[PDB]
Design a protein around this motif. Structure first.
Motif, PDB file in Angstrom:
ATOM      1  N   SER A 684       0.824  -1.205   0.000  1.00  0.00           N
ATOM      2  CA  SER A 684       0.000   0.000   0.000  1.00  0.00           C
ATOM      3  C   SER A 684       0.859   1.256   0.000  1.00  0.00           C
ATOM      4  O   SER A 684       1.301   1.724   1.054  1.00  0.00           O
ATOM      5  N   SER A 686       1.256   5.242  -1.452  1.00  0.00           N
ATOM      6  CA  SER A 686       0.573   6.416  -1.993  1.00  0.00           C
ATOM      7  C   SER A 686       1.426   7.008  -3.113  1.00  0.00           C
ATOM      8  O   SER A 686       2.154   7.988  -2.940  1.00  0.00           O
ATOM      9  N   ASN A 688      -0.051   8.073  -5.940  1.00  0.00           N
ATOM     10  CA  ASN A 688      -0.898   8.967  -6.720  1.00  0.00           C
ATOM     11  C   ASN A 688      -0.523  10.428  -6.527  1.00  0.00           C
ATOM     12  O   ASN A 688      -0.738  11.243  -7.431  1.00  0.00           O
ATOM     13  N   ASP A 689       0.024  10.781  -5.366  1.00  0.00           N
ATOM     14  CA  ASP A 689       0.310  12.170  -5.048  1.00  0.00           C
ATOM     15  C   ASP A 689       1.728  12.598  -5.394  1.00  0.00           C
ATOM     16  O   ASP A 689       2.053  13.777  -5.232  1.00  0.00           O
TER      17      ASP A 689
END
Ligand SMILES: Nc1ncnc2c1ncn2[C@@H]1O[C@H](COP(=O)(O)OP(=O)(O)O)[C@@H](O)[C@H]1O
Ligand SMILES: Nc1ncnc2c1ncn2[C@@H]1O[C@H](COP(=O)(O)OP(=O)(O)O)[C@@H](O)[C@H]1O
Lengths: 701, 346
Positions: A684, A686, A688-689
Motif C-alpha cells: 500500500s 501512496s 498517486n500524489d
C-alpha cells in the motif's frame, strides 16, 4: 599558582592538568603534590592527566576545597612528594552526626574498601570522606602518629578504637549540596554560575565598580529541578549565607507582620554581605490575577520588588528567583530594574539522566549486575527529582525484602547487612512499576545523537543545509562582507513519514546545537484554549537556548496560530544562530502570503527516498534491531517503487515481532521472517500524489 | 467516661481495597513498624501520600487500621472544626495539630477532606483559605529528618486539589483507594455481617452481584436497613419491649432475603456512578471464534507483559494500540473482558 575549576572524576587525591604544568616543576605521571591553602593549610593529592582541562585552570572536586577551606578560583603553589616519608601508625575518628546509631567502629566496613591500593596520601588532621552504604560519612584524622603527611599502606593500622567525635564548625559538610552533586544538568547552569560568581567571588571588585548590578535571575520551568539546591550549592561554593524565603510561610502570617517577615528576610543578611536570598514558587506568591481577591498579596509583592533594591551600590544582596511558569508572573514585576533577565533550567535529557543517575547512586552501593544505561532511556519526560525518588524507593525495596524477613530488626541498626546489601536491576524495574510520570509530558530541549545522515539531505540539499546550519557559527562577518544576511527559513514538503523529522534531528546533531520538536496537535488543542502566550513563551525559551534550531511540522493543519508565528518571526535572532525550519506534506492549502523573502521562503523539495536511500535507511533501521548475516539489502528494495521510511519501519517492526512471536512458540532465525517480510500481500503505497508533488515542483520549477 | 475502643479494631476490617492495601502497607511499614531502623535511613523518606477516589470508602478506618497495626499514635485533624475558628488561632490549631505528635514519634496524622480545605479554583476569594493551606505546606517540611511523623491525606478528586499542594517533595507518589468490585463486595459483606447473624436461606453472593458500582458504605447501609426491616416486625407487635431492652429476642431474630430486597428498595443509585477498574470475571473460553484475531490478541497481551526480554533481544518497543473495526454488537467489548482476564490485566 593554579586556579580552581571543577573536574569530572569523583575521586579524591586527583590532579587533572595539561602537560606544561607537570613538566614545569618536574612532576611525573605517578606522583604526589602538596596543596598550599589559606592560613598555611596543607593537602595531599596525586597527579593524574587529562585532555579537556584548560591548562592554567586546575580542576578538582569539593574535597580539596574542603581541606584547604578555599573556594573556586584561588591561587595554590605546588610542592612535590619528597618533602615527607612513608609513615605508619594510623587511626581514624569520624564525625558523630555523620553517622546515626551505626554499628561498630565501621572502619572494618569502610576503610578497607577505601584502600583501592593507589596509596592515597593523608595529611595530619585533614578531611576526607568515603561514600557507600546508603549514606556518606566523613572521616576525620585524629589519632594518627606518622610523619605529618602519610601515604596509606595496606600494612598500616586499620584501627577501630575511637568514637566518632563532635563536629568542629569552621567547615561545612559535603552532605550539603555542591556543584558536582548537581551534575545531571551539564548545561547553562555553568553559565549562570559564570554570571553570578563575580559579586560573590570578587566582592571588593564589585564594590569599586560602576556596573549597574545584575540583581536577580529567574529559574522557572518544571518543579523539582534542584533550584533550592542550586541556591544552596552556589552558597556552599562562594561561602555566602543562604536563607530560603519560601512563599507560604511569608503569606501564612497576619497582615502587617508579614511585611516585617519580609524585613527580617531581607536585612538579616544585608549586613552579611555577600549573601543569597531565595523567594521560590513565585506563582504562589506573585501572580497577576483577580483570582487573588484580596490585597495582602499585593502588599507582599509590592515593596518586595522595590526593596530588593536595598543594594545602594555598596551592598551585595543577590536574589535567585524560582517559579513554575513565567507567564503567570506579573510583568511589572518582570520590568527591568525590578527584574532584568531570564534563563530556564528546564527538563533534563536522557544523556544528562545518565550522570544524574550516576551521581545520585554514590551512596547506595550498586552491584555489578546492573548497567545503568538502559535505566535512563525509558524515563524520558521525567524530572531528576523523580529519578531520585526512583532510586530512593529502589533502595527501599532492596532493604525491604531483607532486614525484616531475616528479622534483623532491633533498636540498633545493622550496618554490615545494609552494606552487604545492594540494589539490582529488577529493583529498578519495580521502581519503574510505580507512579513515576507525575512529572508531565511537556516540550523538551535535547542535544541530539542521530548521525547517519547528519551532513544535510540527499543531493545538493546537503550543500545548502550544512552551510545554512553551521557556517554562521564560525563565519558571521563573511556574509555581510559579501553583501547580505543569511536565509530565514526553509520549507520541507513531500511524502510523509520519510524520516524528515529525524533528518532535522541529525541536522541539529551536526551543528552541535539543541533541537526543538514542536508538533501540530499540541498547538492545535490550545488554539481552542487561546494560549498563544505559551507558544511565544516556548519560542522565547528556544531563543535563549542558543545555539539551537526550531523544527515545526504540519503547519497546514492550522489560520491563526500560523499568523502569530508570522508576527513573532520578525525579530529573527540570526546573531543568536537559532533557526526556524518548517515541515508539511500538503503545501497548497496553506496561504501563499508567507512565501516572501526575508521569511520562511526557501522551497527545496524533499524527495521520496531512492532504492539506495532505502538501503541507507534500512542500515539506519537495523542498528536498533540486528539483522541476519544472510541479508541482501537490494533484494529488500527490489520491489519498492515508492516505499517510504515509515513503510520500511512498518516492515521491520512486524518482521521482528513475528520472529519474537515464533521464538517463544516452541515447547519450553530471522531470514524466514525477512522472506515473509518482502513476500507478504500488501504494498500500500501512496504513489498517486507524487505526480501532484511534481506538479508543485515544476510550479516552482 | 469511655466508649467502644477505636484502637481495638481488626486489621481485616477493610477488605474492599485488597489490590492497593498490599502496596500501601508495603510503602508505610518501614517508617512506622521500624522507627529505630528508619532514623538510620539516609535515603530521603516517604514524606507524602494521597488517597483520592469515591467518598465514603473507609479512609478513616484505613488510617485507624494502619495506626493500630503499627502501634503508633493516631490523631485525626478534621477540616471543619479547624476551619471553624477565626483567623490566627485556626493557624495555631493547625500548628498544635502538627506538633503534638512530633514528641510522639512515630505517629500518623489524618487531614481528610482536602477538597473542602485546599481547593484549586479562581473562586477562592479572601485570605483565610490561603493562610490555612500555607504553613500546612511548610510545617509538613518541619520534620528535621529525625522525626517519624507522617501525613495521611484523604480527598475525592485530585484536579480540585491545588497543584502547589501537589508539588513533588511536598507530596510523593500517590495511590487510589478505587471502588470495591462485587468479588470484593463478597468479603466486605462477609466481614460486616459477623454481628447480625443472618439466616442461612440466603446465599449472600448473588446479593453482592446486583450492587455492582456501589460503595461499601452503601453495602453497610444495605445490611443496616435490611436488619431494621428484619426487626421491625417484632419488639412492638408482640410487645417484647420489657423494662430493659430485650436483646436476646432480637439477637435470636435473623435477617433474610426479602429484607435484603426491601433494603434494595432504597437508594442504591445514591452511590456515585463511576468507571470501575477491575480484573474481569469473564474468561477466555466464554468467547469463541475469529481465531486469527484471537491468537494475535493473545500474543499481543501475553508477550509484551510477560516476556519483555524477548522483545528487547533485538531491542524494540512493543506495539501499544490495536484496532477493532467491524459490525457492532458482535462482542468486541465482550472479548475485551476475556483478553483482560486471561493475562491477569485490569
Ligand atoms: N540537575 C540535577 N542534578 C542533581 N539533582 C537534581 C537535578 N535536578 C533536580 N535534582 C533533584 O531534585 C530535587 C529537587 O527538590 P525540590 O526542593 O522539590 O525542587 P527545587 O529544589 O527545584 O525547588 C533535589 O533533591 C535534587 O537532588
Ligand atoms: N471498600 C470498603 N470495604 C469495607 N468497608 C467499607 C468500604 N467502603 C466503605 N466502607 C464502610 O464505609 C464507612 C466509611 O466511613 P468513614 O471512613 O467515616 O468515611 P470516609 O470513608 O469518607 O472517610 C466505614 O465505616 C466502612 O466500614
Amino acid at each position: 599558582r593554579l586556579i580552581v575549576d571543577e573536574a569530572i572524576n569523583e575521586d579524591n587525591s586527583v590532579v587533572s592538568l595539561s602537560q606544561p604544568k607537570m613538566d614545569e616543576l618536574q612532576l611525573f605521571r605517578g606522583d604526589t603534590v602538596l596543596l598550599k591553602g589559606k592560613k598555611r593549610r596543607e593537602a595531599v593529592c596525586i597527579v593524574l592527566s587529562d585532555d579537556t582541562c584548560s591548562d592554567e585552570k586546575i580542576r578538582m572536586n569539593r574535597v580539596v576545597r574542603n581541606n584547604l577551606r578555599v573556594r573556586l578560583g584561588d591561587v595554590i603553589s605546588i610542592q612535590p612528594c619528597p618533602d615527607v616519608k612513608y609513615g605508619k601508625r594510623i587511626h581514624v575518628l569520624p564525625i558523630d552526626d555523620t553517622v546515626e546509631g551505626i554499628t561498630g567502629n565501621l572502619f572494618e566496613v569502610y576503610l578497607k574498601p577505601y584502600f583501592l591500593e593507589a596509596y592515597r596520601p593523608i595529611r595530619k588532621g585533614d578531611i576526607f570522606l568515603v561514600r557507600g552504604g546508603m549514606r556518606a560519612v566523613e572521616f576525620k584524622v585524629v589519632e594518627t602518629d606518622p610523619s605529618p603527611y602519610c601515604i596509606v599502606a595496606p600494612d598500616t593500622v586499620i584501627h577501630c578504637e575511637g568514637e566518632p567525635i563532635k563536629r568542629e564548625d569552621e567547615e561545612e559538610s559535603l552532605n550539603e549540596v555542591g556543584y558536582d552533586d548537581i551534575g545531571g544538568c551539564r548545561k547553562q547552569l555553568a553559565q549562570i554560575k559564570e554570571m553570578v560568581e563575580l559579586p560573590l567571588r570578587h566582592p571588593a571588585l564589585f564594590k569599586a565598580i560602576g556596573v549597574k548590578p545584575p540583581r536577580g535571575i529567574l529559574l522557572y520551568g518544571p518543579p523539582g529541578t534542584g533550584k533550592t539546591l542550586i541556591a544552596r550549592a552556589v552558597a556552599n561554593e562562594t561561602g555566602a549565607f543562604f536563607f530560603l524565603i519560601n512563599g507560604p510561610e511569608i503569606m501564612s502570617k497576619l497582615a502587617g507582620e508579614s511585611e516585617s517577615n519580609l524585613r527580617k528576610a531581607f536585612e538579616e543578611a544585608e549586613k552579611n554581605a555577600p549573601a543569597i536570598i531565595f523567594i521560590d514558587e513565585l506563582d504562589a506568591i506573585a501572580p497577576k490575577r483577580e483570582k487573588t481577591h484580596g490585597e495582602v498579596e499585593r502588599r507582599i509583592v509590592s515593596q518586595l520588588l522595590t526593596l530588593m533594591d536595598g543594594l545602594k551600590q555598596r551592598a551585595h544582596v543577590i536574589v535567585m528567583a524560582a517559579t513554575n511558569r513565567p507567564n503567570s508572573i506579573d510583568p511589572a514585576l518582570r520590568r527591568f530594574g525590578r527584574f532584568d533577565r531570564e534563563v530556564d533550567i528546564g527538563i533534563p535529557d536522557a544523556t544528562g539522566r545518565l550522570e544524574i543517575l550516576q551521581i545520585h547512586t554514590k551512596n547506595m552501593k550498586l552491584a555489578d549486575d546492573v548497567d545503568l544505561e538502559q535505566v535512563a532511556n525509558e524515563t524520558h519526560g521525567h524530572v531528576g527529582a523523580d529519578l531520585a525518588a526512583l532510586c530512593s524507593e529502589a533502595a527501599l525495596q532492596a532493604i525491604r525484602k531483607k532486614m525484616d524477613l531475616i528479622d534483623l530488626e532491633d533498636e540498633t541498626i545493622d550496618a554490615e547487612v545494609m552494606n552487604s546489601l545492594a540494589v539490582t536491576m529488577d529493583d529498578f524495574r519495580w521502581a519503574l512499576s510505580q507512579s513515576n510520570p507525575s512529572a508531565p509530558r511537556e516540550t523538551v530541549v535535547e542535544v541530539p545523537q542521530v548521525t547517519w545522515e547528519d551532513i544535510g539531505g540527499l543531493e545538493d540539499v546537503k550543500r545548502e543545509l550544512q552551510e545554512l546550519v553551521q557556517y554562521p557559527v564560525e563565519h558571521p562577518d563573511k556574509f555581510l562582507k559579501f553583501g547580505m544576511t543569511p536565509s530565514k527559513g526553509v520549507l520541507f514538503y513531500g511524502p510523509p513519514g520519510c524520516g524528515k523529522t529525524l533528518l532535522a534531528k541529525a541536522i541539529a546533531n551536526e551543528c552541535q546545537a539543541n533541537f526543538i520538536s514542536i508538533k501540530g496537535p499540541e498547538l492545535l488543542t490550545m488554539w481552542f484554549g487561546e494560549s498563544e502566550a505559551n507558544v511565544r513563551e516556548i519560542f522565547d525559551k528556544a531563543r535563549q537556548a542558543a545555539p539551537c534550531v526550531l523544527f515545526f511540522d504540519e503547519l497546514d493543519s492550522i489560520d491563526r496560530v500560523i499568523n502569530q508565528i508570522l508576527t513573532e518571526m520578525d525579530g529573527m535572532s540570526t546573531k543568536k544562530n537559532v533557526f526556524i525550519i518548517g515541515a508539511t506534506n500538503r503545501p497548497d492549502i496553506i496561504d501563499p502570503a508567507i512565501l516572501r523573502p526575508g521569511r520562511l521562503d526557501q522551497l527545496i523539495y524533499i524527495p521520496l527516498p531512492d532504492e539506495k536511500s532505502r538501503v541507507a535507511i534500512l542500515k539506519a533501521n537495523l542498528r536498533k534491531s540486528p539483522v541476519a548475516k544472510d541479508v541482501d539489502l537490494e533484494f529488500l528494495a527490489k520491489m519498492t517503487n515508492g516505499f517510504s521510511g515509515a513503510d520500511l519501519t512498518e516492515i521491520c517492526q512486524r518482521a521482528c515481532k513475528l520472529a519474537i512471536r515464533e521464538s517463544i512458540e516452541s515447547e519450553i532465525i530471522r531470514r524466514d521472517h525477512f522472506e515473509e517480510a518482502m513476500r507478504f500481500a500488501r504494498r500500500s503505497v501512496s504513489d498517486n500524489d507524487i505526480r501532484k508533488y511534481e506538479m508543485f515542483a515544476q510550479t516552482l520549477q
